[PDB]
Every structure is written in structure tokens, then in C-alpha cells.
Write a protein that binds this ligand. Structure first.
Ligand SMILES: Cc1cc(S(=O)(=O)N(CCCCCCN)[C@H](C)C(=O)NO)ccc1F
Ligand SMILES: [Zn+2]
Length: 488
């Protein structure tokens, strides 16, 4: 336990001793993000703004992250709501901690992405570059194969959908074995785009970490010793999943993920190869040009290979549950406008198909999926879970729902290009039936249309018919639009 710790510490002793006080300080900033002083913020608001705060329906919002909704309610006592909505969007940017590792993960390493304030984006960049320069020493071709490094990870870091049910509610010290097989089904490779911080000695799991990574470095892998038995690894490395098993540790159940370090490029190629292949296959199915670029894989993080394989099922479910003609027509419209199906594990404000059309950061959105009319693209973010969605496949259909809206209004006026949900016919339909479907459907016309579209294509046919009953005017309006599109 302490031998191999001592052997690593020595190997890195010259390196450690050589650390500037400024560099030693940087590695601390990295491990411990600089949270916002709760006081430092409230002393920025105006007297008018203070009012709107202490009395807004906070703990139950649309965009309010759990870490955000808590940190925020932590301030309402230092003293929905639609004009508090545009207020919140702005306030959400001024309270994010300064968390380098998070910045790398959100952006997939594309730190230049215009998704935060320029001067803060530059700070991150200065720090990330400094750390790269700090981490110059390989593990060396002697230690790499005689030691194991360990990481404990929360399952929700990799897929929030499948992590909600990875533990039996039956028995919470055992793992549901079905969800295991499809977690491990297509888990072949991984990508760290930030700095992995790993233990020299396997550490006992804490509250919600049921994944116990056991990792084997390569001779070239660059790393640095951190006090108390840890290593910090250079970012941008690839991991080949070598064995995913269920092990037992002190009469609870865990997942052993065995991984080897390999060049990020080896995986990037694999992803590139896959992205080619899936366009090949779906260009044929849609009768689009052999070489058309419709599907994009934007993949940079730890459940890499699954994002890829997931996209195949999502696209299969799309073809199974939606008339062939509706699909072919609408996709041809998206490609007519250089559109994209984008499957990704970086957050959505860091997807170019979104950020180049929304300059203001306070109006950039992250969530399970998105449609961007200005770039005619569907963005689907693998790792998270949308509220009220069974699987990632359903969320897609919701977004295609948005593109169906798009084509329908283009076809009303090729000149006055607009959304059908902005035609007064559907606007009126919404004020009646707008509250009869999903709770989220009540948000606005467009979303109501999308959710209705979604439900109207469930594999659960009870749900399909519940739309005809509770919102028959919405139902007919949609199927109309469909019939409309199929006729060129
Ligand atoms: C129900 C449902 C939710 C989501 S979502 O990703 O969580 N989401 C709303 C978040 C508030 C995004 C902004 C959305 O509406 N994109 O069009 C996507 C699909 C879906 F069907
Ligand atoms: Zn939507």
C-alpha cells in the first residue's frame, strides 16, 4: 500500500520540489474550485433587484441546477415568475464556481468556445496552459506496468438516464443486472478531456460512487504527484475499456471498470470511422447523396463510445415510429439548409451549431436536446436526462417535432419564413388545450406542439391515444401539417 506510494513519490520528488509557489498554488485551485462568496454576490444587486429575489418561486424552476437552486435559495434567506425568468438567466452566469476541470469537460477541451465571458475564458486558458507545462514528466517505462491507479466516479457522470435505475430500489446494496449489461454493452472506450485526479491506493467508495475505475498508465502518460497519495494526469488521453465487472466490497456491490491508457488519437479515429459509417448507412435510407454530412459526433468525454452507439438506436427508433415520408421530407429540408444531427457529450452551448447564432451567453441553453432553426440542427446531449423523458430516443422525437414545425411554416410562406406555431390558428389552439398534455407542454406554443408531436409517436400506444382525447384540436392540427408536408 505504502511501498508503491513511496515509489511513485520518489519518482516525482525532483518534480515536486521544483514547483514554484505559483504552480503549487495552481494545482490547488484545480483540485478545489473557487466557489462564489455568498455575500460577494448579494452585494451586487440593486434595491429593485433585491425585492424580486427574496420572493420568487425558486426551488422549482426550469433552468435552476440542483447545485444552483440550492446555492441560490441559500441567499433568498440572506434577506412561476416570467420577468424573474430573464432575470435568472443573467444571474446564473455570475455564480458558477471557477472550476477548471469542469470547464474542460463542459467544452470537451475546446476552451475557446464563446460560452463564457471573454476575460474569464482567457483566465481558464492561461491556467490550463500553465498546468499542461507543469505536467511534463512521464510515469516512465518502468513504473507504468507495475502499478494501478484508481478512480471513484458517480454513475451519473456518465449517463443520468441509466444511473437513476442502476441501483435496485429492491436492495440498494446490489446492482440491477440488466442495467449492468447495457451499461457494459457498448462501453469500449473513454476520453478524459480534463485532468484526471486518481488515487495510488484504491480508496473506499463514498456516498454515491458505485463505479470503481482501476487504471493502467502508459509509459508516455504525463502525470504529477499530489500530496496524500494521488496523481494528476495530463488531459486529453484515451482509455480502452478492458473489463467491466461486478465486484463485491464489504457486502455492497460495485462496478469494476478496468481501463488502459492509449493515445486520444486512436479513439478519435474510431469515432471518425463511426461518424462516416452512420452517414453512409442513413444517406442510403433517406436517399441522400452518398457523401452528405448530416450526422455529427461531437465526443470528448468518459462515456465516449456509448454516445456513438446510442445514436444508432435513437435513429432507429426515429425511423420505426415516424412515417418514412415525413422523415425524408424534413431531413431533406434540414440538409437543404446545411443542418445536422448532433450527438454529443460536451454541453450544448459549446456546440457551434448553437453558439454561432446566439451571441449573448445569457440566452445560450444546455439540456437533453435542442432544435436550432438558424442552423437547422438537432442537438442531443447524451450524458444528461431530460425531465419527463423515458429514454434519449424520446427526446430526439421531441426535437424533430420542432423541425416539423419549422418546415410547416416555411411551406406556408417561402418568403415570410416562420414557425407554424406562430400562425394564429395554432396560437388559439394552444390557449385551450395548452394545459391538457405534459406539464412541460404548457410552456409555449412551440413546445406544446413538440411534446404533442412526441407523445403522438410513443411506442406506448396508450399515450398516443391520450393525445386524441385530451387535445383533439391539437391532434388534428398536427396530422394535418403532416399530410401537408408529405404532399410536396
Ligand atoms: C420533455 C423534453 C425536455 C427536453 S429538455 O432538453 O430538457 N429541454 C427543456 C429544458 C427546460 C429543451 C430546452 C427543449 O425543450 N428543447 O427543445 C428536451 C426534449 C423533451 F421532450
Ligand atoms: Zn423543445
Amino acid at each position: 500500500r505504502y511501498e508503491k506510494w513511496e515509489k511513485i513519490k520518489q519518482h516525482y520528488q525532483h518534480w515536486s520540489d521544483s514547483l514554484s509557489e505559483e504552480g503549487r498554488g495552481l494545482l490547488k485551485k484545480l483540485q478545489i474550485p473557487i466557489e462564489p462568496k455568498k455575500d460577494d454576490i448579494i452585494h451586487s444587486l440593486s434595491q429593485e433587484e433585491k425585492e424580486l429575489l427574496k420572493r420568487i418561486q425558486i426551488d422549482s424552476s426550469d433552468f435552476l441546477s440542483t447545485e444552483e437552486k440550492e446555492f441560490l435559495k441559500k441567499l433568498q434567506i440572506d434577506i412561476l415568475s416570467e420577468k424573474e425568468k430573464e432575470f435568472l438567466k443573467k444571474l446564473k452566469l455570475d455564480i458558477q464556481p471557477y472550476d477548471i476541470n469542469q470547464r474542460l469537460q463542459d467544452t470537451g477541451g475546446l476552451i475557446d468556445s464563446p460560452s463564457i465571458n471573454l476575460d474569464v475564458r482567457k483566465q481558464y486558458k492561461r491556467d490550463i496552459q500553465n498546468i499542461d507545462a507543469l505536467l511534463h514528466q512521464s510515469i516512465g517505462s518502468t513504473l507504468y506496468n507495475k502499478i494501478y491507479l484508481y478512480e471513484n466516479m458517480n454513475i451519473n457522470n456518465l449517463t443520468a438516464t441509466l444511473g437513476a435505475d442502476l441501483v435496485d430500489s429492491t436492495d440498494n446494496t446490489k446492482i440491477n443486472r440488466g442495467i449492468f449489461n447495457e451499461f457494459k454493452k457498448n462501453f469500449k472506450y473513454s476520453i478524459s478531456s480534463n485532468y484526471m485526479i486518481v488515487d495510488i491506493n484504491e480508496r473506499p467508495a463514498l456516498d454515491n460512487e458505485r463505479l470503481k475505475w482501476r487504471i493502467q498508465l502508459s509509459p508516455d502518460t504525463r502525470a504529477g504527484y499530489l500530496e496524500n497519495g494521488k496523481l494528476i494526469l495530463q488531459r486529453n488521453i484515451g482509455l480502452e475499456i478492458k473489463d467491466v465487472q461486478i465486484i463485491k466490497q464489504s457486502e455492497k456491490e460495485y462496478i469494476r471498470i478496468d481501463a488502459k491508457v492509449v493515445p486520444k488519437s486512436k479513439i478519435d479515429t474510431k469515432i471518425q470511422e463511426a461518424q462516416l459509417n452512420i452517414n453512409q448507412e442513413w444517406n442510403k435510407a433517406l436517399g441522400l447523396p452518398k457523401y452528405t454530412k448530416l450526422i455529427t459526433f461531437n465526443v470528448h468525454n468518459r462515456y465516449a463510445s456509448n454516445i456513438v452507439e446510442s445514436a444508432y438506436l435513437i435513429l432507429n427508433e426515429w425511423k420505426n415510429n415516424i412515417q418514412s415520408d415525413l422523415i425524408k421530407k424534413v431531413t431533406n429540408y434540414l440538409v437543404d439548409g446545411n443542418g445536422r444531427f448532433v450527438f454529443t457529450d460536451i454541453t450544448l452551448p459549446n456546440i457551434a451549431e448553437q453558439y454561432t447564432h446566439q451571441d449573448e451567453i445569457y440566452e445560450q441553453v444546455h439540456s437533453k436536446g435542442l432544435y436550432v432553426p438558424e442552423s437547422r440542427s438537432i442537438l442531443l446531449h447524451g450524458p444528461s436526462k431530460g425531465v419527463e423523458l423515458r429514454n434519449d430516443s424520446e427526446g430526439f422525437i421531441h426535437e424533430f417535432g420542432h423541425a416539423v414545425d419549422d418546415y410547416a411554416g416555411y411551406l406556408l410562406d417561402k418568403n415570410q419564413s416562420d414557425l407554424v406555431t406562430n400562425s394564429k390558428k395554432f396560437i388559439d389552439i394552444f390557449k385551450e388545450e395548452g394545459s391538457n398534455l405534459t406539464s412541460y407542454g404548457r410552456t409555449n406554443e412551440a413546445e406544446f406542439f413538440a411534446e404533442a408531436f412526441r407523445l403522438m409517436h410513443s411506442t406506448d400506444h396508450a399515450e398516443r391515444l391520450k393525445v386524441q382525447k385530451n387535445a383533439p384540436k391539437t391532434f388534428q392540427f398536427i396530422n394535418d401539417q403532416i399530410k401537408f408536408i408529405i404532399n410536396s
